[PDB]
Design a protein around this ligand. Structure first.
Ligand SMILES: Nc1ncnc2c1ncn2[C@@H]1O[C@H](COP(=O)(O)O)[C@@H](O)[C@H]1O
Ligand SMILES: Nc1ncnc2c1ncn2[C@@H]1O[C@H](COP(=O)(O)O)[C@@H](O)[C@H]1O
Ligand SMILES: Nc1ncnc2c1ncn2[C@@H]1O[C@H](COP(=O)(O)O)[C@@H](O)[C@H]1O
Ligand SMILES: Nc1ncnc2c1ncn2[C@@H]1O[C@H](COP(=O)(O)O)[C@@H](O)[C@H]1O
Ligand SMILES: Nc1ncnc2c1ncn2[C@@H]1O[C@H](COP(=O)(O)O)[C@@H](O)[C@H]1O
Ligand SMILES: Nc1ncnc2c1ncn2[C@@H]1O[C@H](COP(=O)(O)O)[C@@H](O)[C@H]1O
Ligand SMILES: [Cl-]
Ligand SMILES: [Cl-]
Ligand SMILES: [Cl-]
Ligand SMILES: [Cl-]
Ligand SMILES: [Cl-]
Ligand SMILES: [Cl-]
Lengths: 154, 154, 154, 154, 154, 154
């Protein structure tokens, strides 16, 4: 199947700036389905598991400080090629390089000790599966119809 | 303190229509703070507890069918006189009577066996406290700063 | 049935100002269905038939000049109590008196010899039936499903 | 002259999802002029004439089923280099590959047996002339001033 | 003439929250013309002159502290019955009482020692003339055409 | 420091079309800070100083006629790598070539004797310093906190 699930984290900078709704709307308007979502305040150990691949990189600690600064909204988006699509929608890692039209391109720019970039998006299907399991239990993910689902029945 | 918390449920009709983000944005833009939020699928037992006061009213069964139709997003909003303010933003119970500019006035109209009206908003501080405790555990509610909080320091 | 059809004319001032899309979106977002629509350039004869009830009123000539100034978009909206709902969304006849949130309240203000007010909305089911028949042939009106129609199945 | 006319079809997926207004607004905001527009329900024979160049391609029938699934809105846009400009605004054929900011990039993703992609846009001046004639009679196209036309007088 | 000019001050809370553009857009969309505008940082002397009528009221000191907290944007709007129209668009003095759809109703809520309410709007033609002369020199106010001005030629 | 200041001119075509607010909002939403702004009607000599680098180019006079056609809004934006960022946000010089998502890509297209392109953005730090000094005195530029500034403290 082409339908995939990916993890998105609306980071502290977006939450603090009141951009939760605007970000979610971009995904809904694209046709992506929110199958799981919740506001949580990530603890350092959970944050380090999420970013375990960067544990030896210079920006690691600053990244942990940043992602755990305030509560965030973690959500699982489902849809055709969702992983690559959401990555495209997010834009370049550093918002200053992100193209206008992308989430980081339109909303991000300023940085702290960390490169604040509005949201996190799984980089691959493998990472998505791992990340989703880190933040969500199966009972927190749902299968339900969005309004236009019937239109695409093959 | 004038600051209070109220419960909002983004109902199945809003979730199915992809209006989660637009609704959240209206609250964020107003200055209200999201201190708790999660997508859940309410079962009949939980639904009947939430609407226990209407247990004997005619529209009860249809109301339970409606609120449990698909997952919903339950969220807690915090702010100055949040309870009455959110009710004002919501608009008339039946969307056809809701004024343009309100959530129900701009997004609602069509009904099923139930009067589908986009969101639920606690009708009082007493109801808010009861409803918040019904859907959220204390650890799921947070105290953190929104960008402009410092501006209002009294 | 509570479902009805009403006629809306996006007037010359709205067409010239590039507000066709924004007006249509307000109706779509409300849940109303566009069952007919076309851009036409009304001539004096057709205009006088549409406004036949004002044939003797003072503002008649200026009203005809206004509605025939440039092409307009005539459209038929279908929905629960569509006639009164659309009138409510339109706002006060003179835009200066229209409430913020309404179409006239948000988009209208300036006037010519005529009280330019962005759109026309049938004032009753009787007027709607007459107006729809004046601008549309039966084959130009359609019955089809909007995405969320299934949700409201009674 | 650099002024051209191109044909746009707001496809069934966009109509069903209630995106007619949002799409039209993008063209109006760009400065393009709507010189013709109407909601019609395309018949199979007309659809096959429109897509005659793909009659021998594997996806042909699915394309006909898709474009005739529900009514659509056909419109003619006029403006400087309108053909190439509207094509750029539409984005990649498959919405998953379309850049954020484009119509397909922001609104499309899910597919049926056909690659549902929100709108159709003439691919060349030659195709535009042919397509416009297929859906519109000369009496349905208009020459009138948009608000800012005077500003660009050379 | 029904045309008049009124003074609007986009207050510190709106500037700090990044709402300058959204506020200006509401006036532009209504059809009002910006004939003067500038970002300035009001000192106590200028602030007290502007609010001279409240010199003896209880909230005076806090009001001066508020309006001089950060730079503001002062602007002059011109249009049909602009004074009362802008007051209508602004909404109730205390944002919690302001109706959804109005500027204060959609953007304001939280308060400091002062009733932060997003913008200031002249309360009468007499006040407008005084306020405009206080903040602007004649050479900073312009007479020019907005795109659709020609449409309203009487 | 990475923080820079750049000059933006909302050109006559944007002012006439009522796009001042929408343009400003894009900068505010990106996180850029407006440290100076005012509506002025540029005189030919000032315009020629601003565009002194093009004095010998064929389109020079038409450019002067265009930039001095009606009042404009000049503003100084401050932020991380502001010069290159604002240039990216503006898009290609000729709006027809500008990517959807950029200011010129979304709002520009039509041209007069001059290539009307909505806004001007300094092309380099050197040009920015020179251009800012041409339109602003030091007393017209301010240092103040935007809501989220504290979040990025390093
Ligand atoms: N230099 C950096 N500073 C702060 N965070 C970073 C930096 N580089 C990468 N990150 C974080 O790691 C994520 C993935 O980066 P990458 O795997 O290189 O695409 C980025 O989206 C940020 O969340
Ligand atoms: N008359 C009614 N008919 C159907 N549903 C209703 C009615 N009144 C209230 N409800 C439902 O119960 C909710 C709360 O009503 P209330 O107790 O008046 O605040 C409404 O938002 C609807 O979801
Ligand atoms: N007093 C008036 N002055 C000028 N035009 C009017 C007036 N009343 C109504 N109209 C025009 O006639 C339309 C329908 O009016 P009504 O019959 O009151 O629904 C209004 O939307 C205007 O286009
Ligand atoms: N694989 C496909 N499935 C469904 N429709 C397609 C497909 N390929 C092309 N189309 C349709 O044909 C149009 C033109 O495609 P093309 O000429 O290759 O740019 C597309 O915009 C669709 O409307
Ligand atoms: N009761 C009040 N408490 C605090 N501030 C007020 C009050 N009334 C008015 N103000 C401030 O003075 C401004 C003008 O008030 P007004 O004279 O009623 O038009 C209001 O917009 C507030 O900025
Ligand atoms: N052909 C042209 N016609 C009108 N204005 C132009 C033209 N070329 C350049 N300009 C103006 O000069 C600015 C800078 O152009 P450039 O330095 O080539 O990037 C453009 O953004 C316009 O403001
Ligand atoms: Cl990018
Ligand atoms: Cl209401
Ligand atoms: Cl009204
Ligand atoms: Cl693309
Ligand atoms: Cl109000
Ligand atoms: Cl570009």
């Amino acid at each position: 199947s082409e339908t995939e699930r990916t993890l998105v984290i609306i980071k502290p900078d977006a939450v603090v700036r009141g951009l939760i709704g605007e970000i979610i709307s971009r995904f809904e308007k694209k046709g992506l389905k929110i199958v799981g979502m919740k506001m949580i305040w990530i603890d350092r150990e959970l944050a380090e598991k999420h970013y375990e691949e960067h544990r030896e990189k210079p920006f690691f600690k600053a990244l942990i400080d940043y992602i755990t600064k305030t509560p965030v909204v973690v959500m699982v988006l489902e849809g055709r090629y969702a992983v690559e699509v959401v990555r495209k929608m997010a834009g370049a890692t550093d918002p200053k390089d992100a193209a206008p039209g992308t989430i980081r391109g339109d909303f991000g720019l300023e940085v702290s000790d960390a490169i604040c970039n509005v949201i996190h998006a799984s980089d691959s299907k493998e990472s998505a599966e791992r990340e989703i399991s880190l933040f969500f239990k199966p009972e927190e993910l749902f299968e339900y119809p969005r309004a236009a689902d019937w239109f695409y029945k093959k």
